[PDB]
Structure 1
Amino acid sequence: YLDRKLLTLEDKELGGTVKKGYYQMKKVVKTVAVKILKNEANDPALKDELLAEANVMQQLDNPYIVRMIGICEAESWMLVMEMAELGPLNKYLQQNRHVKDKNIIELVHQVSMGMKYLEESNFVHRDLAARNVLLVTQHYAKISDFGLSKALRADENYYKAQTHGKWPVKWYAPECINYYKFSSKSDVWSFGVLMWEAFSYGQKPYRGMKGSEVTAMLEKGERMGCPAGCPREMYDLMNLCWTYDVENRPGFAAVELRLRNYYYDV
């Protein structure tokens, strides 16, 4: 738990309510991003989600995952993260349309390294989308938003949800939609959608379609087309991520290899 007296918040709300702040550490100040909830008139489920996020993010340690500073219980309830100051990747690419192919590949490779770590750690993210990739710099991406994430049971490779909730269905794999089963391979499917977004400079996927129409499209074997100017090898990797059968879809170790820009062995 953090000391309210060591936190300064700027008033501007970004996009729970979000503010930038400065948190005084043992020697230096750290720039932070804070999600803020009201103490009494809050939504208990939304607070439960951020407590769940905190519980997950306390167990993670990787350079491509946003680091939590802590929780502050004061005039409001606050979840404090190290700030990735350039913000969400989708918004960044919408506003910066001359980011080069090599640079987009570098960023999505960093996401694949964070996700290879998550997969090794046996956590499922369950909301992997370009809006949840935050940029530290134009050459350094981090994964964020662990509100739906789950620690997998020791005896299974998937989390089974009771039924469909309110979900980011356009990023979800068919086994998620049809059987409510979430594995790291389901996150790989989402990563393919994230790649499409990144090479479409933050356009929304399955534009104009209802979730039910996306399900029917995918079951027929149809997929989003290649973004204008997208490197062919990156569109081919998207299609591999969008393998319908979860058993033939690659895991993140295989995907991460395919985003490296140097020679390697498997």
Structure 2
Amino acid sequence: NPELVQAVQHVVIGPSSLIVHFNEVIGRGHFGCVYHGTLLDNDGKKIHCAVKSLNRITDIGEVSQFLTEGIIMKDFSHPNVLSLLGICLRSEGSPLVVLPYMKHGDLRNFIRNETHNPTVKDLIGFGLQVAKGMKYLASKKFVHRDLAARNCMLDEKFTVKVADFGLARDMYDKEYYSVHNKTGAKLPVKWMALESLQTQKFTTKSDVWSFGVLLWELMTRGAPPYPDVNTFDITVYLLQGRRLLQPEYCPDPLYEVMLKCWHPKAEMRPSFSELVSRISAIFSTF
């Protein structure tokens, strides 16, 4: 499609700019592996990067859909939102999606790591970062649909980046995805707002619900949500008004914030602007 090739042209990367280390796999998704790479910016310097292969995709139509949906990310720019470096086009072999390198990986493993032992304050700071990244996306009217600790990365300066959207979205670990929902597709049902499970629709408000689960993940340092609720039962569980319990080391006012995030009435849940304020307030008390 022309329109699409137009926009991709904006972010095209010439192969001689890009070195991929195919011996260096940093993740496997349904579309293909992600590799270590190094990119050369025009005015000099080596940029370490993550290179996503789309070689698994067979249908050209699947690729058009994917670029189409994902390309708008090039318009985003915010220190708490993952950026697109560019797209490399080639002869044999699919386009490579070029993304920033995240030295410290995903937030969930980072905080589960026992030698890291992040403090409650560190944990709340990470949460505040994610809040600010979501505030930006909502203002662009972009709905994430899969916010969670496993989908936020940390760079070498320990800046948190909301990720796994757009050209970076793929199934990377299916443990916490389930087809037991109305669409029949693998969805993150234990992060989904009640109404999305019922109506199959996603909004910024259900992003807020997910951010609420993400917070609980931080304060438990990466414990799995609802470990004793079957994926068959998560809707009924929530209808009954039951919710994730307060973590041992979660401050009380932060648990309030979580609970506001899981209000059954979608419009009764705070905005990310609200969240950034409230959570910022709580962070300062530390």
CA separation of 1:125 and 1:45: change in aligned 2, threshold 3 A: farther
How far residue 231 of structure 1 moved from its aligned partner, in angstroms, is: 2.2
For residue 91 of structure 1, give the secondary structure of its aligned residue in structure 2.
helix
Separation in 2, partners of 1:47, 1:119? 26
Aligned equivalents of 1:133, 1:19: Cα separation in 2: 18
CA deviation vs aligned residue, 1:111-143 (integer Å, no higher than 9, x gap)? 100111111111111110111100014641010
Give the counterpart letter for 2:140 in structure 1.
S
- Equivalent residue runs for 1:3-18 within 5 Å: 3-10=14-21, 11-15=23-27, 16-18=32-34
Q: Residue 13 of structure 1 aligns to a residue in which SS?
A: strand
Equivalent residue for 1:37, pick from 41, 50, 54:
54
- Residues 222 and 147 (structure 1 numbering): CA distance in 2 closer, same or farther, change over 3 Å? same
Structure 2: give runs of 5+ residues left out of the alignment. Answer: 1-11, 169-181
Cα 1:180/1:58, change in 2 over 3 Å? same
Q: Deviation string for 1:225-254 (max 9, x for gaps)?
A: 122322222222111111111011111111
For the 8 Å contact 2:71–2:166, the answer to whether it is kept is no
* Structure with the higher helix share, 1 or 2: 2
Q: 1:248, 1:225 → 2: CA distance?
A: 20
Counterpart pick for 1:228 among 228, 248, 273? 248
CA distance 1:250–1:37, shift in 2 (3 Å): same
Matches within 5 A, 1:233-252: 233-252=253-272
Query: 1:95 is matched with which residue?
Result: 113
Could you give the per-residue CA deviations for residues 209-240 of structure 1, whole angstroms, max 9, x where no partner exists? Answer: 33331111111000111223222222221111
Give the Cα–Cα distance (whole angstroms) in 1 for the partners of residues 223 and 52 of structure 2: 25
Q: Is the 8 A contact 2:126 2:160 kept in 1?
A: yes
**Percent sequence identity over aligned pairs:** 35
Q: TM-score, normalised by structure 1?
A: 0.86
Name the SS of the counterpart of 2:227 in structure 1.
coil
Label 1:146 to 1:213 Cα distance change in 2 as closer, same or farther (>3 A): same
- Alignment match of 1:206 (pick from 207, 226, 234): 226
Give yes or no for contact 1:54–1:68 (8 Å, CA) kept in 2.
no
Q: Within 2, Cα distance between the matches of 1:88 and 1:132?
A: 6
Shift of 1:57: 1.0
Task: Tell me which residue corresponds to 2:212.
Answer: 192
2:145 equivalent to 1:126: yes
Aligned-pair RMSD on alpha carbons? 2.3
Summarize the Cα distance change of 1:234–1:137 in structure 2 as closer, same or farther, 3 Å threshold.
Answer: farther
Equivalence for 2:239: 219
Aligned length: 249
Q: CA contact under 8 A between 1:243 and 1:249: conserved in structure 2?
A: yes
Partners of 2:87 and 2:267 in 1: CA distance: 39
- Name the structure 2 match of 1:78: 96
- C-alpha spacing 1:262/1:230, structure 2 compared with 1 (3 Å): closer
Match of 1:168 in 2: 188
Name the CA shift for 1:45/1:143 in 2 (closer, same or farther; >3 Å): farther
In the alignment, the residues of structure 2 paired with residue 84 and residue 49 of structure 1 have an alpha-carbon distance, to the nearest angstrom, of 26
